Ligand binder design. Structure first.
Ligand SMILES: Nc1ncnc2c1ncn2[C@@H]1O[C@H](COP(=O)(O)OP(=O)(O)OP(=O)(O)O)[C@@H](O)[C@H]1O
Ligand SMILES: Nc1ncnc2c1ncn2[C@@H]1O[C@H](COP(=O)(O)OP(=O)(O)O)[C@@H](O)[C@H]1O
Ligand SMILES: Nc1ncnc2c1ncn2[C@@H]1O[C@H](COP(=O)(O)OP(=O)(O)O)[C@@H](O)[C@H]1O
Ligand SMILES: [Zn+2]
Lengths: 370, 379, 120, 370
């Protein structure tokens, strides 16, 4: 069917939907299911037992937040079906899923059962004309408009580094670590309890993510800022109460660059970028260092590019040019890539038709992926 | 060398005594009776000005070191037991009081969970700490606390005391002694915390899982006609002499259920062990599960350990925990001292080790030089 | 063992010989760890359908005065020995001595060295 | 009285010369704890080694000191040798002379620094380094024939005819047990079961050793794996959790025979064994086909010998008879050779003494290596 394809980013934190024609995603809402915290027997309470996106944000304190997708993998599929149904609601897009074809953006090196079940839902529950699963990293390059480039895509659920040179992705050089934005939000909650402010509730976890997003700066030297006495910058909560964050502000997102501090066995965001380049062939190393692209929401931390440049330089070889080319629209970069890809006439060949999936089998989605 | 003193500053009660003893010498409510104030102010209070906190701790430590313990503070060392993720400014103040005013030789800031493990003798064990403020859990594997897989919920003494006060005010039946033989509701606007605590301990008990699960659905009244078990007999409690409060049988076995209630989120005192254990490393699972430790005075409540261990094994079969923690054998450790004084006993056992104490502990000469207490946060 | 290890490590750092092997390098006490019970004793069925006398059960205050084995029942609760009191002596930061009390403070209101702001 | 100490990348096999099997066999690893700023409990060792670190895997970060038969961290290797002599063997290194094993075509600094430690740190009376492949022949009572000694670190092919080695015919391949273990993690992550940490990698090695087997026809085995669930076997982890690895069982050891899977762009363990024989003189080829030995624990895969024979026979001429020599004790084939060599009265002269080391230096080893 010729009618405009619907791009949808499967972001663990925030799913971004919209049409391929639009330069930006019109409808982007948080990826969580909202049910009433108190188990509702009586009338005059929150009805439906389902609150998604803007409806949830309004009555947030009353509801109990449950993320359906963890570490770029779908844990509860029933929840994810309701989320994708809300994408084709009167609230967002307001269209038939049966008419328009779909593009998914699954993280690299995900389970094959995750891709197979994702297709089954979108072909059976929704009567889609055609579906195409793609890598988040490959899209990010289409948006910026360069063929060569390493893509350090720090999402909410997963942070992954994929090196692609002249439209060729080395699949062995891909590096994936689970320590992402959501873990930084979890570790900030621990440090906030060490400052003396508890956020025990699942609703109260959402305002820790807001505190992180508002006020958390990455110091170039962490040891000097610790010895220096903090200003203790006040943050205002939804109720109106003030909280002085203090040293927790800067030593929370540090755990990205040094995850051994809390006690998580991972490489680190500076390390995975360098290791991904060093794993690739010697001839390409210089060009891959010379073309690095930051993607996702967990790069927007104040002074992230400043710290990463410094942490990469000392690990990388001496007298090598390191350009970390961040776009202005890092959060919405992954979708814009899909929107451009979808618009091209080549995409018509790439996607798998509904009749193709019935005849060919299950492999059809996997083999056409690349 | 002299036998080092052990102090354990809590919101409800403080444990005090000397190292290498069977239990604590003095255990008292963590308050101070200041002139003018009718009700005594609580000594540990998080999120206040440092100068006001300094004065309260100076007043309290003085009472511990002279009226309760009889020993010179400057002469012998200190082993300060405090829970992990204790507020930064509070711990900084407590040390600054001991080092500046009292001029103690050296303080050792031991985490309560690692101390509780020493008392049993086992090197690795899961430790739940159901205290006053928050019921915290922290897996300890072969001497190393795993901060990565922490867990805390506000389902302790404070949350239970508040729940009791609410229920009593609804079904309020007091005999004032002024033509008040007939049921008189809410004669007093608020009930003092000292009374509520005494009612909780004597009257209220923890129900069986089978009876408790019925009580949860009963008070909910989820499309059912009077589906509650038969309650215990109503106990009459004296308030301030003449006033006799008749405590309803339902309140006794329903007040506790707020701890073990699911409340949609799936966040109980029971769930917190399994939520933490599932997040732990794959190799450590079977060792931690087999070695459970239940400290804190909230777990002293009669029939708490049976309900918890039962509620665990029920929540195991639930589909979320069924995959990972399905075929696991959960066995509880019985510590030598009572559930309240497990934390203290560890510090005393550690305090008896004079050789290791001096090395690990922070000396006054170091603090006066630097002015930087070591913590699990960055240096 | 840790003291000997820490001492051996510290004198090796102080020596600064880079762990030079001049000589050859390198009875045990084993406690049995407490056995974990499969099922803890349940709450007795007496507690259900029995009048609770507040005289028989003990309050928190009198429970906690006997901390070594704080008993719920009154019949278990034994009388503890009477707590000894203290005779304070004050010493300043800059000054050395200030005031003190006799060796027979029992049944005496005499100060060995009387010093107070009202007396100067 | 003499000591044989195999310095394998996977496992360190140590024992007394003359004995049938090695006394102490432990995994060659150093376990440093994921420590926070929180104080540690009692009975605390700063760095654990071997069977102790294998017991306390959960918390300790496992770091293999030898990578591809090259000692990367010498301070770590020193702590293993200290655990080998003093604790494991219960013997003084000053009394007994120590035979060590190095893989062929290793860096010269490796052999140089190895002996320097043995002479200075441990103060051994004599030290001789030997090629692992040269020892492995003595195990089978064969002077003539090639060996395919595939270890955890490296795999090497050393052709030796009538007690004379062909040095130029020796070929080294970096593909080995640890690369297969790393490969098995990736394909298990594709199935669903994610293994990231260093402790988890050790559990994946236990899965590999027990289940994984070499297929005769890979394409035929993949067809049976797709149709029927007969090849699918269950394994219990340290946790009660059980996993069904499926087709990935026989997919892991395939990487040996076709490195393209791992993405090395090199010849297979079958093809390198053929290439090594062709590099040798035309006359002696006959005996090398007739006496092809498989050594190390990477040749203890069920049915590698059958697959090896098939692949060599196809490449080799039709008239030639290809017999693969697979003794029951392949894992201890390097050590048992060392025990036979050290015991022989002829070898008494070949030892490098302290006096010889003191006068000449550490460079003497390169002359009296092989
Ligand atoms: N029965 C088995 N089946 C399959 N793989 C095995 C088996 N036993 C061991 N392995 C794998 O092969 C490796 C064999 O290591 P081994 O014990 O031979 O020591 P090594 O370090 O390779 O020594 P060397 O290089 O001297 O042979 C192990 O690390 C493991 O990954
Ligand atoms: N301005 C910001 N500053 C700091 N962190 C941010 C900011 N915006 C988003 N984040 C973090 O990044 C997350 C968004 O990740 P996102 O880019 O949507 O991932 P994905 O690429 O998988 O869609 C948020 O949940 C939050 O943790
Ligand atoms: N022996 C007991 N029996 C029953 N309940 C008790 C007992 N001792 C204490 N409690 C209750 O449990 C709580 C235990 O708190 P505690 O652990 O002493 O304080 P903290 O957590 O601040 O160290 C008290 O506030 C009290 O309500
Ligand atoms: Zn003076």
């Amino acid at each position: 069917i010729a009618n405009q394809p619907v791009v949808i980013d499967n972001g663990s934190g925030v799913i971004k939907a919209g049409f391929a024609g639009d330069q930006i995603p019109k409808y982007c809402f948080p990826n969580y299911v909202g049910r009433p915290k108190h188990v509702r027997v009586m009338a005059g309470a929150l009805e439906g037992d389902i609150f998604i996106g803007p409806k949830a944000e309004e009555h947030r304190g009353l509801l109990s937040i449950r993320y359906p997708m963890e570490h770029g993998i779908v844990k509860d599929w029933n929840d994810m079906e309701r989320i994708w149904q809300y994408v084709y609601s009167k609230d967002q897009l307001q269209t038939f899923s049966e008419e328009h074809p779909v593009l998914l953006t699954e993280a690299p090196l995900n389970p094959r059962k995750n891709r197979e079940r994702a297709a089954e839902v979108f072909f059976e529950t929704f009567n889609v004309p055609a579906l195409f699963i793609s890598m988040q990293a490959v899209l990010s390059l289409y948006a910026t408009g360069r063929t060569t480039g390493v893509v350090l895509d720090s999402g909410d659920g997963v942070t992954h580094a994929v090196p692609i040179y002249e439209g060729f992705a080395m699949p062995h050089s891909i590096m994936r670590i689970d320590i992402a934005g959501r873990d930084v939000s979890r570790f900030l909650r621990l440090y906030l309890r060490k400052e003396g402010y508890d956020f025990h509730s699942s609703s109260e976890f959402e305002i820790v993510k807001a505190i992180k997003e508002r006020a958390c700066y990455l110091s170039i030297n962490p040891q000097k800022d610790e010895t220096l006495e903090t200003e203790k910058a006040q943050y205002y909560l939804p109720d109106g109460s003030t909280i002085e964050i203090g040293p927790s502000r800067f030593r929370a997102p540090e755990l990205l660059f040094r995850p051994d501090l809390i006690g998580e066995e991972s490489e680190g965001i500076h390390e995975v970028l360098v290791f991904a380049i060093q794993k690739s062939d010697m001839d390409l190393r210089r060009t891959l260092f010379s073309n690095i692209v930051l993607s996702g929401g967990s790069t927007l931390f104040k002074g992230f590019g400043d710290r990463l440049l410094s942490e990469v330089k000392k690990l990388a070889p001496k007298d090598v040019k390191i350009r970390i080319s961040a776009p202005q629209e890092r959060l919405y970069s992954t979708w814009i890539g899909g929107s451009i890809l979808a618009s091209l006439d080549t995409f018509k060949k790439m996607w798998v038709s509904k009749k193709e999936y019935e005849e060919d089998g299950a492999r059809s989605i996997h083999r056409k992926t690349f | 060398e002299k036998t080092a003193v052990v102090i354990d500053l809590g919101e409800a009660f403080t444990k005090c005594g000397f190292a290498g003893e069977t239990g604590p010498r003095c255990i008292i409510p963590s308050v101070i009776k200041k002139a003018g104030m009718p009700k005594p102010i609580k000594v540990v209070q998080y999120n206040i000005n440092t100068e006001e906190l300094y004065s309260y701790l100076k007043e309290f430590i003085h009472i511990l070191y002279f009226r309760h313990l009889l020993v010179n503070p400057r002469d012998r060392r200190v082993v300060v037991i405090e829970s992990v993720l204790c507020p930064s400014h509070f711990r900084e103040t407590l040390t600054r009081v001991l080092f500046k005013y009292f001029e103690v030789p050296s303080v050792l800031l031991a985490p309560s969970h690692l101390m509780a493990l020493l008392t049993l003798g086992i090197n690795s064990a899961m430790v739940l700490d159901c205290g006053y403020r928050e019921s915290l859990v922290l897996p300890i594997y072969e001497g190393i606390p795993v901060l990565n897989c922490w867990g805390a919920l506000p389902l302790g003494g404070k949350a239970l005391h508040k729940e009791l006060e609410t229920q009593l005010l609804e079904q309020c039946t007091v005999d004032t002694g002024a033509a008040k033989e007939q049921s008189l509701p809410s004669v007093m606007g608020s009930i003092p915390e000292g009374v509520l605590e005494d009612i909780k301990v004597r009257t209220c008990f923890v129900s069986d899982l089978t009876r408790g699960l019925k009580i949860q659905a009963a008070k909910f009244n989820i499309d059912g006609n009077t589906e509650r078990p038969s309650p215990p007999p109503n106990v009459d409690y004296p308030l301030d002499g003449e006033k006799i409060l008749h405590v309803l049988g339902s309140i006794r076995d329903s007040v506790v259920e707020i701890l073990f209630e699911q409340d949609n989120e799936e966040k109980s005192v029971a769930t917190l062990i399994l939520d933490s254990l599932m997040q732990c490393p794959i190799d450590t699972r079977k060792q931690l599960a087999e070695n459970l430790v239940i400290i804190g005075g909230t777990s002293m409540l009669p029939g708490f350990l049976h309900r918890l261990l039962a509620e665990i094994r029920y929540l195991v079969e639930k589909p979320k925990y069924k995959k990972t923690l399905g075929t696991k054998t959960f066995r509880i450790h019985t510590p030598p001292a009572k559930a309240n004084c497990v934390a203290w006993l560890g510090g005393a056992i550690f305090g008896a080790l004079q050789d290791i104490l001096g090395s690990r502990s922070v000396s006054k000469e170091y603090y006066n030089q630097t002015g930087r207490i070591p913590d699990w946060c960055s240096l | 063992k840790e003291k000997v290890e820490r001492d051996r490590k510290k004198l090796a750092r102080r020596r600064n010989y880079m762990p030079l092997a001049f000589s050859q390098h390198t009875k045990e006490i084993k406690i049995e760890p407490a056995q974990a019970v499969d099922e803890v004793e349940p709450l007795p069925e007496d507690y259900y359908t029995r009048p609770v006398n507040l005289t028989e059960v003990t309050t928190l205050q009198q429970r906690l005065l006997q901390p070594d084995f704080q008993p719920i029942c009154a019949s278990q609760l034994y009388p503890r020995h009477k707590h000894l009191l203290i005779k304070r002596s004050l010493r300043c930061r800059q000054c050395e001595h200030n005031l003190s009390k006799p060796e027979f403070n029992p049944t005496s209101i005499k100060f060995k060295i009387q010093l107070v702001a009202v007396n100067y | 009285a003499a000591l044989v100490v195999d310095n394998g990348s996977g496992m360190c096999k140590a024992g007394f010369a003359g004995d049938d099997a090695p006394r102490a066999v432990f995994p060659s690893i150093v376990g440093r704890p994921r420590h926070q700023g929180v104080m540690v409990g009692m009975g605390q060792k700063d760095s654990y080694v071997g069977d102790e670190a294998q017991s306390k895997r959960g918390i300790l970060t496992l770091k293999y000191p030898i990578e591809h038969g090259i000692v990367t961290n010498w301070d770590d290797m020193e702590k293993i040798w200290h655990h080998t002599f003093y604790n494991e063997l219960r013997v003084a290194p000053e009394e007994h002379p120590v035979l060590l094993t190095e893989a062929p075509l290793n860096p010269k600094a490796n052999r140089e620094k190895m002996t320097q430690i043995m002479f200075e740190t441990f103060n051994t009376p004599a030290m001789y380094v030997a090629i692992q492949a040269v020892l492995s022949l003595y195990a089978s009572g064969r002077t003539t024939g090639i060996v395919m000694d595939s270890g955890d670190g490296v795999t090497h092919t050393v052709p030796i005819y009538e007690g004379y080695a062909l040095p130029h015919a020796i070929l080294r391949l970096d593909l080995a047990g640890r690369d297969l273990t790393d490969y098995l993690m990736k394909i298990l992550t594709e199935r669903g079961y994610s293994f990231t940490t260093t402790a988890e990698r050790e559990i994946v090695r236990d899965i590999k050793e027990k289940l994984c087997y070499v297929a005769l026809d890979f394409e035929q085995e993949m067809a049976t794996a797709a149709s029927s669930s007969s090849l699918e076997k269950s394994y219990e982890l340290p946790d009660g959790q059980v996993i069904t690895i499926g087709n990935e069982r026989f997919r892991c050891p395939e990487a040996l025979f076709q490195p393209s899977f791992l993405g090395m762009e090199s010849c297979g363990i079958h093809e390198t064994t053929f290439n090594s024989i062709m590099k040798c003189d035309v006359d002696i080829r006959k005996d090398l086909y007739a006496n092809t030995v498989l050594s190390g624990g990477t040749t203890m895969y069920p049915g590698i010998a059958d697959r090896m024979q098939k692949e060599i026979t196809a490449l080799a001429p039709s008239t030639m008879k290809i017999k693969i020599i697979a003794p029951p004790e392949r894992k201890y084939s390097v050590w048992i050779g060392g025990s036979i060599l050290a015991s022989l009265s002829t070898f008494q002269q070949m030892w490098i003494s302290k006096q010889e080391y003191d006068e000449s230096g550490p460079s003497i080893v390169h002359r009296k290596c092989f």
